[PDB]
Subunit: 106 residues, 2 copies
């Protein structure tokens, strides 16, 4: 992992969860965020810093400034529990990866 | 209580720590960050989202977007161990406050 993420984030149902991702000059790369439930297909939730793919709710938002990219999830529910991974792209590349954050909804 | 921060963040010396601060439409306000060691004066480390007072190490940076403001400390030192509190100002309405994050180095 060349990108740093908190190992874990915990929130109560309905609270907003935020997950950070840091690296040197991360802001000059596009951040991508994946929701990964063990044994299931990864889901891209945010791309190019702040863009939501079709089918991803306005609940999910992202930004990338300076050395830190942040994914925010409002109105967290149980089905948001997963590992979240950031990656930074630019090309001519290559993708650098974060270590993952376990999100628990208590 | 108005803004939400993680209860704690733990890092090893030299590692990057980030602390989040969330609230509805927080991104439309100015975020301010205070470092507070018990029994000492609070120290303003970041103001107006990303601005750094003189005397504050360049290791400290911040940003604010959507519903989340983020304080980042690169190359964390034992001296940085403290409680960190976010606040948000409308420069027209009353400040709203976060509940504080304990940063432990080690």
């Amino acid at each position: 992992y060349e990108l740093t993420q908190p190992p874990s984030v915990s929130v109560s149902p309905g609270q907003t969860a935020s997950i950070t991702c840091s690296g040197d000059k991360l802001g000059d790369k596009y951040a991508y965020w994946y929701q990964q439930k063990p044994g299931q297909s990864p889901v891209l939730v945010i791309y190019q810093d702040s863009k939501r793919p079709s089918g991803i709710p306005e609940r999910f938002s992202g930004s990338n400034s300076g050395n830190t990219a942040t994914l925010t999830i409002s109105g967290t529910q149980a089905m948001d529990e997963a590992d979240y991974y950031c990656q930074a792209a630019d090309s001519s590349t290559a993708v650098v990866f974060g270590g993952g954050t376990k999100l628990t909804v208590l």
